Amino acid sequence: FAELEVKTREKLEAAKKKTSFEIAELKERLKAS
Amino acid sequence: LRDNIQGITKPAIRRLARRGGVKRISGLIYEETRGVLKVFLENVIRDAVTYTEHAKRKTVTAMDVVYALKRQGRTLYGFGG
Amino acid sequence: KRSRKESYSVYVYKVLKQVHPDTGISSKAMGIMNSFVNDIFERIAGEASRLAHYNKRSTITSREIQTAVRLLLPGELAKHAVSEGTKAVTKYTSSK
Amino acid sequence: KSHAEIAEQAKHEAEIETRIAELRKEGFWSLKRLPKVPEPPRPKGHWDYLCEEMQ
Amino acid sequence: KRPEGMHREVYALLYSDKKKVRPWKWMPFTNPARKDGAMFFHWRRAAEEGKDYPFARFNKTVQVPVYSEQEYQLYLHDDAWTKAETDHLFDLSRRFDLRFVVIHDRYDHQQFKKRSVEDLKERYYHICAKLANVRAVPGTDLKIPVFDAGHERRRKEQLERLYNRTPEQVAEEEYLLQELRKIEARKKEREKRSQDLQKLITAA
Amino acid sequence: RAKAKSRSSRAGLQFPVGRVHRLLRKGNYAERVGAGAPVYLAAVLEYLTAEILELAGNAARDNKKTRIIPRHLQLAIRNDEELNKLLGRVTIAQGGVLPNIQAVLLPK
Amino acid sequence: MVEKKTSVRSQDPGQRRVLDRAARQRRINRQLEALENDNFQNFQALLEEQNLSVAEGPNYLTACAGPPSRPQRPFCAVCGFPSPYTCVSCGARYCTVRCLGTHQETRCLKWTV
Amino acid sequence: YRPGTVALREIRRYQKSTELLIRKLPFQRLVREIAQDFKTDLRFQSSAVMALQEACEAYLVGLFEDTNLCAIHAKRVTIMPKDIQLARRIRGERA
């Protein structure tokens, strides 16, 4: 279970962080303009 | 899906029995009720699906259930349109 | 591109509004009122059908309809139904 | 998403600009319909009876 | 033998299941609702010749106040309106039952300066208000919200720009219309979603 | 031509004789329908509709309600001796049952 | 043209199911309270302060005379004249065939709901 | 509360309402699990499942009305499994 959960999170947290940072950057740039 | 006959709880049966005049219920009667209800449901559902497979449909409409109930001598009013 | 479905709601409200001027009828109760009409129509027409076929007849008639109403409706229910229909057939053939 | 959305969203920002421009030009809707109508109606009126009877 | 003698269907159903002396007359009648005594003619029975007309009840005159010369001079006086300019408005009011979309069109623009509908309405209403004000004390409901002309001049206007819009504002506006959703979604689906993601990545 | 008169009107019915006879003409209930069958069938259909609507509305009034619910139908069709017979093998959706509590299951 | 009432066929009394006994009482009671009723064709407050006033001593409730020695007289209720007859269903009284006709058409069984 | 006083109250209360007595969500999975054995991937109209429930609650209430008469047969107040069985056998369901 620990290994399967880590294999899941290795995808999940990567996608989540990418999405989070990209969104934050988009929103802040668009509001600055 | 699995183990859905248990979705008919002891209070769920006791209320139905109260509406039927029953005052005191026994311990085993809940399982008897589950068996009887399961048989009746399976028959009605099978007959309804007989009208769907023949109709080449993928969704069981209300008319199918109404007709299945009619074949069982259980004419139901309220779902005729 | 419409999909219109027929029902008896318009004439069950004429009859209800006439036989209960102050009383309305809910949509869910009118569904029952519709299913009841279709059910009895099926029953009386089927019994008249069988009646005609038993006498080796290709036509379901109002005489067979009256005998099917005698078979279907219980004693009083029958009497009233038979009388109502019988009187409706002499008011219709007199060109009123 | 994608960083390319900067362009799409910028176009949407332009949609805001035009929105503002158009709202300065003429507006989107006929706001505040009949806020104040103090005139009392007639009892029913001769002319209205004529209209009804001709109806 | 079968009695029958009646209609086939009804017969089978039944057995198989065992001086005017009221002369109308062409008649004169006067309408009591008229003040001119005009005699008209009518097609009435003999038994009602002489009864009053039944269409005289459909005569409910619209009410309109009638200021007097002294009263007008004291309180109804208005620098922008003269008596000859003001009596005409009330005559048109009465002859057109106090409706102001048809009073306007028949306004005498030859002796009289051009007025919009709103100014005529406000003028007649201030006149009604001050007429009742001469009474006032006799419980004359001094709570009358007489027709707003300012806001309403506007409200007429800021419909007219939206009336004649060949495309764009009638057509292209669809775009901005959709934007109302977009502007109301993607900004919060932007700055708020960002702040939520900043907190989510802060805890992460 | 002549102002067309319907078949519910000439007879004096509310239920559609045209529609009734129509379900019969293309219903294969027979092979050549006559000219009285739909009239009789519609007359009796609507007669029973009235017969019940009566009891349903009366029970409804007993409940101090102005709208007939399916309850005003279960209670009625089970309250009348012959409607129950006619509709004995018929369940009315959302109607309920009648409070028939057995005498032997009561306080003593 | 047609007799123009078979369309509405209001009463159609093949299933008439008379109203009787306690129902009569209800009607009687209703009529009484209607004769005791008010402008519209506080009473709850009156009933409340009257139910405050309940006691065995000399008071509002205990000041009622009661039944009369002189027995009740019949009256027609359609024209108010002395009435030899009673309506078999609702028990209201009348004095002619004509009066029974009017009563059957307007007041018999129709206002018992 | 004296055993049978709160139960008779419920008899008088559930014989006067008309709402369904089985929970919806639990019963709809049973109707889909039973359908399972006839066709993989069958869809149900919402009203179709409601009609199934309206069928079954009425059937069970009738069966519990006919089962009570059998319980009162053996001088009992409790309905016993043989009561459901006797009612159903006299019904021809499992003769």
PDB file of C-alpha atoms in Angstrom, chain E residues 31-120:
ATOM      1  CA  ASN E  31     -80.901  57.709 -23.495  1.00  0.00           C
ATOM      2  CA  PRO E  32     -80.947  59.192 -19.966  1.00  0.00           C
ATOM      3  CA  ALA E  33     -77.135  59.292 -20.078  1.00  0.00           C
ATOM      4  CA  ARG E  34     -77.331  62.080 -22.697  1.00  0.00           C
ATOM      5  CA  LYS E  35     -78.009  65.734 -21.886  1.00  0.00           C
ATOM      6  CA  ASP E  36     -79.208  66.696 -25.390  1.00  0.00           C
ATOM      7  CA  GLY E  37     -82.520  64.824 -25.258  1.00  0.00           C
ATOM      8  CA  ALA E  38     -81.769  63.141 -28.579  1.00  0.00           C
ATOM      9  CA  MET E  39     -84.432  60.580 -29.475  1.00  0.00           C
ATOM     10  CA  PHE E  40     -83.134  57.409 -31.121  1.00  0.00           C
ATOM     11  CA  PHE E  41     -85.054  54.416 -32.449  1.00  0.00           C
ATOM     12  CA  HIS E  42     -84.735  50.816 -31.354  1.00  0.00           C
ATOM     13  CA  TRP E  43     -85.972  47.254 -31.859  1.00  0.00           C
ATOM     14  CA  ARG E  44     -87.679  46.420 -28.559  1.00  0.00           C
ATOM     15  CA  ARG E  45     -90.322  43.872 -27.645  1.00  0.00           C
ATOM     16  CA  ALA E  46     -93.850  45.007 -26.813  1.00  0.00           C
ATOM     17  CA  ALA E  47     -93.480  44.242 -23.094  1.00  0.00           C
ATOM     18  CA  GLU E  48     -90.629  46.693 -22.400  1.00  0.00           C
ATOM     19  CA  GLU E  49     -91.504  49.730 -24.601  1.00  0.00           C
ATOM     20  CA  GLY E  50     -90.801  52.648 -22.283  1.00  0.00           C
ATOM     21  CA  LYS E  51     -88.078  51.279 -20.001  1.00  0.00           C
ATOM     22  CA  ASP E  52     -84.814  53.165 -19.537  1.00  0.00           C
ATOM     23  CA  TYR E  53     -81.800  52.380 -21.688  1.00  0.00           C
ATOM     24  CA  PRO E  54     -79.490  49.645 -20.301  1.00  0.00           C
ATOM     25  CA  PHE E  55     -76.314  51.150 -21.824  1.00  0.00           C
ATOM     26  CA  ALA E  56     -76.457  54.412 -19.848  1.00  0.00           C
ATOM     27  CA  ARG E  57     -74.625  52.794 -16.924  1.00  0.00           C
ATOM     28  CA  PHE E  58     -71.568  52.402 -19.193  1.00  0.00           C
ATOM     29  CA  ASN E  59     -70.937  56.121 -18.837  1.00  0.00           C
ATOM     30  CA  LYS E  60     -68.444  56.469 -15.968  1.00  0.00           C
ATOM     31  CA  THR E  61     -66.882  59.828 -16.778  1.00  0.00           C
ATOM     32  CA  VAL E  62     -63.190  59.884 -15.952  1.00  0.00           C
ATOM     33  CA  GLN E  63     -62.686  62.293 -13.080  1.00  0.00           C
ATOM     34  CA  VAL E  64     -60.689  65.464 -13.718  1.00  0.00           C
ATOM     35  CA  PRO E  65     -60.550  68.446 -11.336  1.00  0.00           C
ATOM     36  CA  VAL E  66     -62.001  71.771 -12.487  1.00  0.00           C
ATOM     37  CA  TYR E  67     -60.096  74.748 -11.100  1.00  0.00           C
ATOM     38  CA  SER E  68     -61.829  78.126 -11.057  1.00  0.00           C
ATOM     39  CA  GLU E  69     -60.465  81.461 -12.245  1.00  0.00           C
ATOM     40  CA  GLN E  70     -59.730  82.754  -8.737  1.00  0.00           C
ATOM     41  CA  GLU E  71     -58.243  79.420  -7.655  1.00  0.00           C
ATOM     42  CA  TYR E  72     -56.026  79.188 -10.734  1.00  0.00           C
ATOM     43  CA  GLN E  73     -54.856  82.773 -10.298  1.00  0.00           C
ATOM     44  CA  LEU E  74     -53.828  82.249  -6.679  1.00  0.00           C
ATOM     45  CA  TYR E  75     -52.057  78.874  -6.662  1.00  0.00           C
ATOM     46  CA  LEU E  76     -51.997  77.281 -10.132  1.00  0.00           C
ATOM     47  CA  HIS E  77     -50.104  80.245 -11.619  1.00  0.00           C
ATOM     48  CA  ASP E  78     -46.931  79.177 -13.430  1.00  0.00           C
ATOM     49  CA  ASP E  79     -44.441  81.471 -15.159  1.00  0.00           C
ATOM     50  CA  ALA E  80     -43.951  78.980 -18.015  1.00  0.00           C
ATOM     51  CA  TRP E  81     -47.682  78.333 -18.568  1.00  0.00           C
ATOM     52  CA  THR E  82     -50.536  80.749 -19.257  1.00  0.00           C
ATOM     53  CA  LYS E  83     -54.207  80.189 -18.488  1.00  0.00           C
ATOM     54  CA  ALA E  84     -54.965  79.867 -22.214  1.00  0.00           C
ATOM     55  CA  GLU E  85     -52.047  77.472 -22.162  1.00  0.00           C
ATOM     56  CA  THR E  86     -53.375  75.465 -19.246  1.00  0.00           C
ATOM     57  CA  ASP E  87     -57.125  75.205 -19.762  1.00  0.00           C
ATOM     58  CA  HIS E  88     -56.491  73.542 -23.129  1.00  0.00           C
ATOM     59  CA  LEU E  89     -54.579  70.732 -21.441  1.00  0.00           C
ATOM     60  CA  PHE E  90     -57.502  69.905 -19.152  1.00  0.00           C
ATOM     61  CA  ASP E  91     -60.024  70.087 -21.990  1.00  0.00           C
ATOM     62  CA  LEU E  92     -57.929  67.565 -23.911  1.00  0.00           C
ATOM     63  CA  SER E  93     -57.657  65.556 -20.655  1.00  0.00           C
ATOM     64  CA  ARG E  94     -61.411  65.255 -20.393  1.00  0.00           C
ATOM     65  CA  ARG E  95     -62.152  64.707 -24.088  1.00  0.00           C
ATOM     66  CA  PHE E  96     -59.495  61.960 -24.110  1.00  0.00           C
ATOM     67  CA  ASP E  97     -60.244  60.532 -20.638  1.00  0.00           C
ATOM     68  CA  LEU E  98     -56.995  61.583 -18.961  1.00  0.00           C
ATOM     69  CA  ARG E  99     -54.715  59.614 -21.295  1.00  0.00           C
ATOM     70  CA  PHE E 100     -51.505  61.385 -22.261  1.00  0.00           C
ATOM     71  CA  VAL E 101     -50.286  59.424 -25.293  1.00  0.00           C
ATOM     72  CA  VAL E 102     -53.278  60.761 -27.268  1.00  0.00           C
ATOM     73  CA  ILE E 103     -53.562  64.181 -25.541  1.00  0.00           C
ATOM     74  CA  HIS E 104     -50.084  65.072 -26.834  1.00  0.00           C
ATOM     75  CA  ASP E 105     -50.644  64.461 -30.547  1.00  0.00           C
ATOM     76  CA  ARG E 106     -53.671  66.779 -30.628  1.00  0.00           C
ATOM     77  CA  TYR E 107     -51.892  69.594 -28.764  1.00  0.00           C
ATOM     78  CA  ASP E 108     -52.353  73.014 -30.391  1.00  0.00           C
ATOM     79  CA  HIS E 109     -48.789  73.744 -31.488  1.00  0.00           C
ATOM     80  CA  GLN E 110     -49.879  76.850 -33.422  1.00  0.00           C
ATOM     81  CA  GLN E 111     -50.870  79.125 -30.433  1.00  0.00           C
ATOM     82  CA  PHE E 112     -48.830  76.908 -28.066  1.00  0.00           C
ATOM     83  CA  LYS E 113     -45.172  76.139 -27.603  1.00  0.00           C
ATOM     84  CA  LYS E 114     -43.965  72.614 -28.169  1.00  0.00           C
ATOM     85  CA  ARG E 115     -44.128  70.362 -25.104  1.00  0.00           C
ATOM     86  CA  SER E 116     -43.053  66.755 -24.641  1.00  0.00           C
ATOM     87  CA  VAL E 117     -45.354  64.176 -23.093  1.00  0.00           C
ATOM     88  CA  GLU E 118     -43.496  64.333 -19.781  1.00  0.00           C
ATOM     89  CA  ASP E 119     -43.871  68.104 -19.383  1.00  0.00           C
ATOM     90  CA  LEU E 120     -47.589  67.970 -20.195  1.00  0.00           C
TER      91      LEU E 120
END
